[PDB]
């Protein structure tokens, strides 16, 4: 589908048996999700952005469905005010920017 940018590009995602709203973010290298108790091993990581860095937990090979499109990859979990779908997953669902 085609998504206009008049409003934040929020879509429904499915991860770890849960439905959430997430922001399609072409400006994010990674996918960062709100704090959630996912099972499995994780490794500590530090990621940054505008106001500085935050500590997050890195989970690998997590199945995730974005707007009905299946994907699988690395997700970072931490204290973020919003769920962000970064380029690592956007490329998997064939997402492109057009103008």
Give the interface with ligand ROC as residue ranges (CB under 6 A).
Answer: 25, 27-30, 32, 47-50, 80-82, 84, 86
- Our answer to whether residue 60 is catalytic in this structure is no
Selection from its own copies, ligand ROC, none that 10 binds (CB < 5 to 8 A by kind) is: none
Q: Is 89 left (phi over 0), alpha (psi -120 to 50) or beta?
A: alpha
Choices 13-21, 37-45, 46-54, 57-65 (CB under 8 A): range interacting with its own copies: 46-54
Is residue 95 a contact residue for its own copies (CB under 8 A)?
yes
Distance CA 3, CA 9 (A): 7
Contact 89, 32 (CB under 8 A): no
């Amino acid at each position: 589908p085609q998504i206009t940018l008049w409003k934040r590009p929020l879509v429904t995602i499915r991860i770890g048996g849960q439905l959430k709203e997430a922001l399609l973010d072409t400006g994010a290298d990674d996918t960062v999700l709100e704090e959630m108790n996912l099972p499995g091993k994780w490794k500590p990581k530090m990621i940054g952005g505008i106001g500085g860095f935050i500590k997050v937990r890195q989970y690998d090979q997590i199945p995730i469905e974005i707007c009905g499109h299946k994907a699988i990859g690395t997700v970072l979990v931490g204290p973020t005010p919003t769920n962000v779908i970064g380029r690592n997953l956007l490329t998997q669902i064939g997402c492109t920017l057009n103008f």
